[model samples]
Target: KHTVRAAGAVLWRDAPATVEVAVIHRPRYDDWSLPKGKLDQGETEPVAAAREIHEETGHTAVLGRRLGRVTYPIPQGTKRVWYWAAKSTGGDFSPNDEVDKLVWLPVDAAMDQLQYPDDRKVLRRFVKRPVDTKTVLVVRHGTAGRRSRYKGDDRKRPLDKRGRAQAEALVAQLMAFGATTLYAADRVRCHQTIEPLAQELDQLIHNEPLLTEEAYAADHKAARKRLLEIAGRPGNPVICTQGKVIPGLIEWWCERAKVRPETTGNRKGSTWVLSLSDGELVGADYLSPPDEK
Candidate 1:
């Protein structure tokens, strides 16, 4: 029998607030379960887990730590599922077509609320362990010119002379922080923003479309999972991106982490800087004003 692999998460929060876990209701089976689905080709388990959570629950969460794996029978054959403990970072939660309803049930209520015994066992182990918060850096591509001005498909538009200079300066600014990895949107402008830094660090640039807010709602889980993998890897410095991607990342992180939104402290013609370790605010000073020539 062919083996089918799957992944999911046990989401949680800290303090006096309710310890709620995300549950997705599937109308086909008339049942509720944690977010899960089959692994995509060439995708890592953590990335798959984050994607499944976002697709199923409409909530973006990052994988905290691995709980364990379980093997269970499905219609075709026995499937092995890898489960991780995800700390909610943030995102909107609305039941999509696949999920009839989405609910955040308290820890005690979750065991009975979930449809399968195997799922319940997974949740139990998650509770026994401590939850760790993972810091994520969500960035957008910087300063691509307007389409009318560029005379090309926006996607093909590389940084203009000024944009190129800004990218150069940003590389120096980020070098001080020693970003762990640089993930960029596949677009030319986004890729250009991080390419200089990647070259300086001697790290391969991992292109991600979800760095754009427009692409984020559709790809939040995959994006979040990638962030978690970066966070989990050892000796990584910081993660850098353009400013536009922060909102969706923040929204997703806040919702999953069950925390209120905090101001990003961005200013006109300034790059936004966030210190992930302490969540401190740092505004842009690296690049000159747009009108500066």
Candidate 2:
């Protein structure tokens, strides 16, 4: 059977008294539905989700947790669409070829207005958690050369050629989640990992001395506390830290939230997209290195 892969989001925004989701009118389908489209070749799901939402609704989005996927039969066979809980950051909608009209409606109203049961199911998942939660992107440092081979202190070890390319690839993936602030463990490898993103965003990378493996081994509590502090900051933060520290920190968070993770693969250049509501962990979506070629 042929499978058509597509991605989109429950594009939402805060209204004065309630949260509103964007529903688009497609003249072709002659129905109201969530913004989405088929993925471009070589595009990752989250990137396609953001792109489709923009192309269909003309709104830039700050992507959140995976709201899961929907699969239905089309002429091609199975049309599977993966979705995310995306918050509308900015941009105005205009009449376009795909979507002739866009309306922002309260969740209940949107549920009534949408034509497909699948779209409503995705919307139902979107409302399971607090829509206004803050996001924190935690990244494991990119590949660095062997620690034993390095002549200087281990903290001075830098990213290798492949690591440099991985770091560059991370800019788009991290930016898709609305990365505003940058932080890295006080190691050269960690700093180099997010350097490309910092350059792209023109944002300073704040140093986190407690986030290194050495620091975390000595005092994990401080490291955890620092992470919560960074999450509570005004904007979405992207932290580039170590592999040793990430698993433990994530485990502690999951334990506190009483949530089990799907898998704990802290591969080099991978990221943990954490969603928090007033300091408590609500969602954690792990993203593998999207630039693996």
Candidate 3:
């Protein structure tokens, strides 16, 4: 009956074609458990879990799929924990103060090695059926009207009639991809670009501030890193924010990664693709001139 918030990762690997889990040892409790802890105020569960994993083990990982929840009693009270499956992209394993040691255990051995029985159940379900891989299409929003001369907030400007048609065309192109998710920036133009697709798909547009031009331009390298991580998630047909945001992200990714932007295809509508694995640019054929109809 008591509600508690906790986050943990069911760490998995695919290298050497083997699956493994990362477990941690707490010195104070003298207990071994999956990487998890109580959520701090104002922190989302997934962000908390990812932060905890890095804090405890010094490894950078991306969350996979939700494996469900677990409940147990602690000295203070009964508690429930949410679990996520995360795959380690890369990082050396170095234990920190809170954790005395970290070990990557085989999935089979994790059940016996982990401290909580409930955690083991969650792991078993995830191990039974691995999540399917996902492919994400990161599209930037189309061009917008000139910045307001009088108004300070350029974000409030709506797409002009030409911009609107471009937005609609972008939506039509996206529909062919059968996108399941549509994310946009909160700006009027960005929202307008994706709204058509959202309506056609019967899906709400997810507004992401991080996808904004100013946000990306501020710290291009870090922004590119985050964009790649988002695109790497498991699920298919995810159409991200519209065309204007994507090209800069790709170029930034290229500059930061020291890879050249490949001009393999013709320009369509200011659209281009960055190959997540090799950092090669593809799909230049999608780019149309900025502000063009």
Give the winner by lDDT: 2
lDDT digits (tens) for residues 173-197 of candidate 3: 4432234676666577767776777
Candidate 3, residue 175: Cα displacement in angstroms equals: 24
lDDT of 2 by residue, 91-172 (tens): 9999977789999999999999998998999888888778676789999989898878545348887899989988987887
- Highest TM-score: which candidate? 2
Location of the lowest summed lDDT over 10 successive residues in candidate 2: 284-293
Per-residue lDDT tens digits of candidate 1, residues 11-78? 66552225788777888888888888887864445556778877776666655445567887778887
Worst 10 residues of 1 by lDDT: 280-289
lDDT of predicted model 2: 0.86
The positional error of residue 220 in candidate 3, measured at the CA in angstroms, is 38
Q: What order do candidates take by lDDT, descending? A: 2, 3, 1
Error of 3 at 123 (Å): 1.1
Candidate 3: TM-score? 0.49
Residue 190, model 3: Cα distance from true site in angstroms: 8.6
